[PDB]
Design a protein around this ligand. Structure first.
Ligand SMILES: CCCCCCCCCCCCCCCC(=O)O
Length: 113
């Protein structure tokens, strides 16, 4: 447990698993998103989910939409307990870039196992 553990790491492992089952013949969301996870206000980890090339990696690259939120918030949204729009209304999540692209991911949350 020497490497910082975050509840949200679990969600990212599930997202990478979900990527394994994409239907190449019927793509639905082809955008690049970045998630900046904070803890105690500081930035602890960055992930880039590239849906154009189909990859999810811990990296600090640029993206079409960037979502910044605390680890607990990412966990809550990713497990389907907190709706994204409510997180935004309560100031628990910040988004830069082409904001509307994030809404395209909502109907896929339920597919995470
Ligand atoms: C609004 C915040 C969403 C955060 C959690 C995202 C979880 C959804 C991840 C789903 C990726 C699967 C996408 C399939 C795309 C496709 O077939 O083209």
């Amino acid at each position: 447990g020497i490497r910082m553990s975050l509840k949200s790491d679990e969600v990212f492992a599930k997202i990478a698993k979900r990527l394994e089952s994409i239907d190449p013949a019927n793509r639905q969301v082809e955008h690049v998103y970045k998630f900046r996870i904070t803890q105690g206000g500081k930035v602890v980890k960055n992930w880039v989910m590239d849906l154009k090339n189909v990859k999810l990696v811990e990296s600090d690259d640029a993206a079409e939409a960037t979502l910044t939120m605390e680890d607990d918030i990412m966990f809550a949204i990713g497990t389907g307990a907190l709706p994204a729009k409510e997180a935004m209304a309560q100031d628990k999540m910040e988004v830069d870039g082409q904001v509307e692209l994030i809404f395209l991911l909502e109907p896929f949350i339920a597919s995470l196992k």
